[PDB]
């Protein structure tokens, strides 16, 4: 009979388990025997307190490096303001030691945990690449609670070295099964930011994770976008509980918050899932998340049923992670077929945007070719356009099965006249749909201003397979 942790703050970890059902169903995974043994997670952040009483037992120097100072030791830099506490808080969410009379427990409290010290310094492209590419045959899962500025006017993503690190990781990492990159979708909610303007979250190679409050609401900091895949609990208003984890200076905190707390909880759940089936590929893991995540009782005004009967929201992706369901489905999972890529250049001429532009195109999705896709995974609309005030644009993409993805919502602070230069807006909302048929792109001016610009390129990029479908939900 499984015995739950006795740690002093475990009763305050409301998001791990409870009678109430407002949790991530993590105790159910523990009771199936999965606690993370043998899985290696690295926190890419501002360092990790490797001697913390709730981390030392799980600490893994092979999962760690200091990119900022170019040494093996990721110890945080101690300051009066405790600026470099962030990575230690994230690490405890994944892998804080259980049943040791200290603080609470990690989701994967028997996993090995490391940290890359890379945020405490200039975060260049090379710095990101060296962190994302660290020991990729030892580290299984990388967790990143950072990214481009959430001011609601930035469009930015991985530069060349970092993107090369993503492709090398998913292609050759973890013995060719592919590194698992987990990303926090962003804190730009107050600025009406869109997490599709962040190339890290918008990447197909990352599992972008959003947040829900204890009472099941969209937190103030949350960013909505179509690239988000799923959700874990985090902080909300001051009547709602927060996240319990290891803090800097060997302390315990019950007030870890924001998007930063959601990605590590997802990384811990993915660690449990990898223990249940170490042969899962990076794409397998995303399929598992899509199939098992739970919308129920998460409040949003945009819940929609996609072409295969799954509920999807721009605030939550496919909903809350469910650790018990993840580890159960993982055990007899059949590896997905190799990923196909079908490139469809849509436009035959540039199109003036004006007040509203609609582009309709019927595609065959590479019918008759080895990259024929009947089972969609990610879809991208790679757009090149000029516009005088970027944040007045709203962009939607409708799949042949009728699923409307918001690629870009209005961003009031985005005054840029720089437009989009082949920006690969991504949606997860048509996962498992047949992409043959009519796709519709809509670009509209959401303001009364007399704005102007031109769409000069629209590449529809479809990823997926041609086999293995389930009967729709």
């Amino acid at each position: 009979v499984y015995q739950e942790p006795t740690d002093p703050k475990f009763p305050q970890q409301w998001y791990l388990s409870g009678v109430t059902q407002r949790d991530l169903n993590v105790k159910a995974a523990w009771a199936q025997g999965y606690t993370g043994h043998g899985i290696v997670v690295s926190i890419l952040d501002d360092g990790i307190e490797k001697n913390h009483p709730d981390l030392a037992g799980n600490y893994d120097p092979g999962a760690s490096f200091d990119v900022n100072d170019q040494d093996p030791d990721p110890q945080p830099r101690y300051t009066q303001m405790n600026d470099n506490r962030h990575g230690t808080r994230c690490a405890g969410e994944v892998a804080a030691v259980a049943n040791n009379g200290v603080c609470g427990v990690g989701v994967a409290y028997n996993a090995r945990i490391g940290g890359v010290r890379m945020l405490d310094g200039e975060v260049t492209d090379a710095v990101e690449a060296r962190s994302l590419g660290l020991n990729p045959n030892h580290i299984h899962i990388y967790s990143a609670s950072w990214g481009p500025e959430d001011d609601g006017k930035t469009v930015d993503g991985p530069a060349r070295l970092a993107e090369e690190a993503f492709f090398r990781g998913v292609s050759q990492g973890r013995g060719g099964l592919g590194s698992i990159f987990v990303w926090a979708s962003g804190n730009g909610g107050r600025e009406h930011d869109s997490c599709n303007c962040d190339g890290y979250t918008n990447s197909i190679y990352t599992l972008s994770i959003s947040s829900a409050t204890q009472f099941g609401n969209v937190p103030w900091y949350s960013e909505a976008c179509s690239s988000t895949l799923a959700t874990t609990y985090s902080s909300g208003n001051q009547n709602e509980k927060q996240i319990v984890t290891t803090d800097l200076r060997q302390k315990c905190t019950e007030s870890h918050t924001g998007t930063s707390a959601s990605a590590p909880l997802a990384a811990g759940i993915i660690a449990l899932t990898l223990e249940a089936n170490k042969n899962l590929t990076w794409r397998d893991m995303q399929h598992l998340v899509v199939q098992t995540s739970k919308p129920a009782h998460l409040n949003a005004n945009d819940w929609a049923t996609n072409g295969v009967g799954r509920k999807v929201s721009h605030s939550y992706g496919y909903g809350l992670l469910d650790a018990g369901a993840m580890v159960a489905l993982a055990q007899n999972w059949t590896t997905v077929a190799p990923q196909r890529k079908c490139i469809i250049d849509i436009l035959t001429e540039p199109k003036d945007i004006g007040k509203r532009l609609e582009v309709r195109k019927t595609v065959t999705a590479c019918l008759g070719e080895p990259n024929h896709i009947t089972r969609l995974e990610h879809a991208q609309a790679r757009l090149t356009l000029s516009y005088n005030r970027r944040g007045d644009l709203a962009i939607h993409l409708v799949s042949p099965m009728g699923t409307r993805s918001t690629l870009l919502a209005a961003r009031p602070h985005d005054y840029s006249a720089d437009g989009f230069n082949d920006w690969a807006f991504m949606t997860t909302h048509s996962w498992d749909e047949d992409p043959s048929g009519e796709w519709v792109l809509e670009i509209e001016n959401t303001s009364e201003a007399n704005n102007y610009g031109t769409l000069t390129k629209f590449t529809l990029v479809l990823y997926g397979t041609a086999s293995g479908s389930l009967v729709p939900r």
Partner: peptide
Amino acid sequence: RRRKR
């Protein structure tokens, strides 16, 4: 910074 926590 180019990237934020």
